[PDB]
Design a protein around this ligand. Structure first.
Ligand code: FCO
Ligand code: F3S
Ligand code: F3S
Ligand code: F3S
Ligand SMILES: [Mg+2]
Ligand code: 3NI
Lengths: 59, 322, 513, 59
């Protein structure tokens, strides 16, 4: 089975080592995605900030 | 040109919309354009055995059937018997089989007939399907390879209901020798109506361009585009709703109602699942899940940010003022 | 003679009528609604506002009514605020749909049967044929063509007709502009002048509304040549000549749920406050007596319907579980229509005829408030000649002038600077009752929202009231009893069955949904 | 077993917290990858758009 093969890859010492190092820095990945979610959910505000900034340079 | 108009799992909204026809109006279409309306459940004089005589003569080839218009879904339940739609002594689906096989042209009017529409929403108790489609999947009741005697597939005049012109202008074209001018898209819809989008001619496209959202219904719709907060499917829906106005007056989007994408085979989209009605599904609260047709989320969002920055003051104010 | 008429068309859907005929008279009747879509089943688990999209699709001709009552079901379920302008727009659009229905149904669905060969001996038959023949009738063509105008008004406010969902909890989606209102007024005045007054009445709406008795109506017919030769005057004379006043009596008991809220009285829709706020009054007229309508008294029986069930259910606990028509027919079930019954004290759960006649009877009830329809005309007609195909039709047609005047006034009442929508709280839970008088009568939604989803959604349409089959007590539905007693001159073309069924303006897509 | 070790890391409160936060913003990641897939599948169109744009500045 192909799913069996992914489990087989997970056994690989080198694959496992890399996956473990990814889970060691999963907090950083989580925070960067949370930061991106924040940036996206405040994208309208950042757009209004760039609008007020350009609008000042217009005046 | 004889026309037999049957209704399966229909609400008759396509007929009523059709009766709103202007230029031509329905009476002038039926009388003055050489279209002999053999029968229509809402308009035919014959009842009972006289009506059945008309139907059987059409089905068996005793009299010519040039256009078979079918409105409503092909109801197959229960258990494929179609007895949830018994018409004139037969399951309506059997009538559909016979008459679609007899007609020179078969026209499915309205999503129900074209694609299954609202009755085909899960759990689809009536076993409803379209003539040649079930939602987007080609084949429906008649099969993907069905062709009428003029060689055409089922002409899908979608909508829920179809606008009167979407059928009447096709009927006029057929009656005036312009059948060859009729081109059909991949959903068998007349491209003369369905190359445009609902958004095409929408009074709110400038707000769309500048990503100015209508925020609320009622007076809130004096400004803004409905795409961002109300799930307007205008930019993802092929229709001339804003080109050829409804009732010669308006369109949903002009009026402040989001386009529900009813000319699209998936209608009702998302099966009206909770949270999808008059709402834009968004990723991370700001990226629409569905972007306009032919755009990708990356470009669309980049252009949207640029437009929000460039947006002129009038795009942020009421425009459909008293 | 057992006569099975299939199809009985021009009832907006699939209807078969079985009748027992003895000595040329129907002695028993069964109405068989033959097409089922199951929208109540579909709505379960959908978005709480899915009704605003689905319910209009119950019916093309009266989907706007469905929208109206579904919106109010949500308004009550969510305890919304309705700005007066929103109430006005809802009233206008409901009434405009009805104003479209009145001529469209009359000419396209009903009056062409007046050309039946059974009437060839009538002295008015040639004129009836000239006027009402399908597609070529001199009254048929303008009546049908102009029937599209009132729904142009509907489209002005709702974007389109049919199939807008612009009536939402908290108001309407639209924000009418000045030109919207002026154009709506112009369309309405043009339609009134060109069809209602010129063609239907041959007089002003005001002159018609001066008719307070049946004798007033007869005097109106004879008053002058314009009214005499109007479609209304001709129709009355034709009915009296050919005997349309002599059968189709029906139950003689009526249900009106009412519609058209006075904007100041229904700003916060509730089930309990609904009746007082109505302009077109609710009212049950049973055993010659007036009763207040109460939705709690509504049950639906499926004994002879193709649904599972063993007891009448109030629609809040309603269920729509289809049974296979083969099995159901083995159990004596014969219709996809449920059998709506109303608990009238001293009478039990009785069938009630819905429709314009029911509304006119309700409007004849005492103690009308100032905003409410107070019209004794059809109390007098009911007492003078009783119900019939002619009287039912006259009630329908009588609503034309009345509703036109109401719509014109509501358009004047619009305060364009004011709100059309109060954003509601979309509560996860709620029980809503929305009702209206669609063209054909009491249309009602009982909705139960649970967990931000539709837990239950039960629609009871006016034709379900009228055409629904026998209940558990074998009591015939209003249309079934109206068919009983109908003469049958020609079993090959039993046009009188059509006259009776269509005099109710039967809508079978609504009946079953 | 190395795969057992990745399951062991998954148990870790801090690893679990980060993986849960990643699955909270998974919709954003999905939409960004869908946006990238879209951009890639319309890359020819964007290239034709840049060609017509440069071709205008050429004329
Ligand atoms: N009018 C109408 Fe349709 C019916 N019956 C609904 O409600
Ligand atoms: S208008 Fe009615 S017939 Fe079907 S396409 Fe829409 S539910
Ligand atoms: S431009 Fe119009 S079609 Fe919808 S997406 Fe905006 S309201
Ligand atoms: S819902 Fe349909 S009628 Fe036009 S505005 Fe949208 S394609
Ligand atoms: Mg029901
Ligand atoms: Ni109806």
């Amino acid at each position: 089975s192909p799913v069996d093969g992914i489990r087989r890859r997970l056994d690989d010492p080198q694959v496992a080592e890399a996956l473990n190092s990814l889970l060691d820095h999963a907090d950083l990945l989580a925070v960067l995605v949370k930061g991106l979610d924040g940036f996206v959910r405040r994208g309208d505000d950042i757009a209004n900030n760039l609008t007020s900034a350009i609008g000042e340079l217009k005046a | 040109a004889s026309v037999l108009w049957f209704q399966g799992g229909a609400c008759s909204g396509n007929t009523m919309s059709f009766l709103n026809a202007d230029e031509p109006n329905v009476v002038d279409l039926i009388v003055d354009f050489g279209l002999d309306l053999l029968w229509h459940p809402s308009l035919g004089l014959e009842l009972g055995n006289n009506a059945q005589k008309v139907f059987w003569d059409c089905a068996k080839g005793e009299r010519p059937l040039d256009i078979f218009v079918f409105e409503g879904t092909v109801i197959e339940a229960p258990n494929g018997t179609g007895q949830m739609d018994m018409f004139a002594g037969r399951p309506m689906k059997d009538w559909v089989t016979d008459l679609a096989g007899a007609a020179q042209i078969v026209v499915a009017i309205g999503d129900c007939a074209c694609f299954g529409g609202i009755p085909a929403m899960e759990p689809n108790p009536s076993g409803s399907t379209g003539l040649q489609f079930h939602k987007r999947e080609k084949g429906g009741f008649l099969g993907p390879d069905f062709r009428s005697k003029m060689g055409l597939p089922v002409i899908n005049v979608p909508g829920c209901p179809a606008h009167p012109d979407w059928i009447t202008q096709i009927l006029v074209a057929l009656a005036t020798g312009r059948a060859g001018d009729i081109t059909l898209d991949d959903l068998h819809r007349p491209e003369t109506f369905f190359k445009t989008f609902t958004q095409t001619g929408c009074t709110r496209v400038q707000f769309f361009e500048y990503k100015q959202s209508t925020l609320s219904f009622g007076e809130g719709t004096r400004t803004g585009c409905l795409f961002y907060e109300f799930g307007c499917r205008g930019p993802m829906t092929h229709s001339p709703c804003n080109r050829i106005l409804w009732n010669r007056q308006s369109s949903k989007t002009r009026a402040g109602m989001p386009c529900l994408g009813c000319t699209e085979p998936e209608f009702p989209h998302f099966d009206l699942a909770p949270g999808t009605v008059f709402k834009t599904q968004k990723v991370s609260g700001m990226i629409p899940k569905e972007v306009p047709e032919g755009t990708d989320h990356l470009t669309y969002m980049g252009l949207a940010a640029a437009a929000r920055i460039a947006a002129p003051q009038w795009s942020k104010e009421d425009m459909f003022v008293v | 003679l057992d006569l099975f008429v299939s199809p009985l068309g021009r009832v907006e859907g699939d209807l078969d009528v079985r009748v027992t005929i003895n000595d040329g008279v129907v002695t028993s009747a069964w109405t068989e609604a033959a097409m089922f879509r199951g929208f109540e089943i579909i709505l379960r688990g959908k978005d709480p506002q899915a009704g605003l999209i689905v319910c209009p699709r119950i019916c093309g001709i009266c989907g706007g009514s469905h929208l109206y009552k579904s919106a109010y079901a949500l308004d009550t379920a969510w305890r919304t605020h309705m700005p007066p302008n929103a109430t006005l727009i809802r009233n206008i659009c409901q009434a405009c749909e009805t104003l479209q229905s009145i001529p469209r149904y009359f000419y396209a669905l009903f009056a062409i049967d007046l050309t039946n060969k059974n009437y060839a001996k009538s002295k008015l038959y040639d004129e009836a044929v000239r006027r009402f023949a399908p597609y070529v009738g001199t009254s048929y063509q303008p009546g049908v063509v102009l029937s599209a105008k009132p729904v142009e008004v509907y489209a002005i406010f709702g974007g389109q007709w049919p199939x807008s969902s612009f009536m939402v909890p908290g108001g309407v989606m639209s924000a009418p502009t000045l030109s919207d209102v002026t154009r709506a007024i112009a369309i309405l005045e043009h339609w009134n002048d060109n069809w209602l007054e010129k063609q239907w009445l041959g007089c002003s709406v005001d002159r018609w509304l001066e008719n307070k008795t049946w004798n007033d109506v007869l005097a109106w017919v004879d008053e002058n040549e314009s009214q005499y030769n109007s479609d209304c005057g001709f129709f009355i004379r034709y009915c009296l000549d050919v005997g349309l006043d002599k059968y189709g009596q029906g139950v003689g008991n009526y249900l009106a749920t009412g519609t058209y809220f006075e904007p100041s009285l229904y700003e916060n829709p509730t089930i309990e406050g609904r009746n007082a706020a109505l302009i077109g009054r609710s009212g049950v007229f049973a055993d010659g007596r007036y009763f207040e309508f109460d939705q709690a008294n509504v049950t639906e029986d499926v004994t002879h319907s193709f649904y599972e069930g063993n007891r009448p259910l109030h629609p809040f606990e309603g269920e729509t579980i289809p049974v296979n028509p083969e099995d159901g027919r083995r159990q004596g079930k014969y219709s996809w229509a449920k059998s709506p019954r109303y608990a009238v004290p001293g009478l039990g759960n009785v069938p009630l005829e819905t429709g314009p006649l029911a509304r006119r009877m309700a409007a004849s009830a005492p103690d009308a408030e100032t905003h409410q329809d107070d019209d004794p005309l059809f109390a007098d007609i009911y007492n003078a000649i009783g119900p019939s195909v002619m009287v039912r039709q006259l009630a329908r047609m009588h609503e034309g002038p009345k509703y036109y005047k109401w719509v014109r006034q509501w358009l004047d009442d619009l305060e364009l600077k004011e709100s059309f929508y109060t954003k509601p709280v979309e509560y996860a839970e709620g029980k809503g009752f929305g009702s209206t008088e669609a063209a054909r009568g009491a249309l009602s939604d009982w909705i139960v929202i649970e967990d931000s989803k539709i837990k239950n959604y039960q629609v009871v349409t006016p034709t379900a009231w009228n055409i629904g089959p026998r209940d558990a007590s074998e009591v015939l539905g209003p249309i079934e009893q109206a068919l009983v007693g109908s003469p049958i001159v020609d079993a090959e073309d039993p046009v009188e069955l059509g006259h009776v069924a269509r005099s109710f303006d039967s809508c079978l897509v609504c009946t079953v949904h």
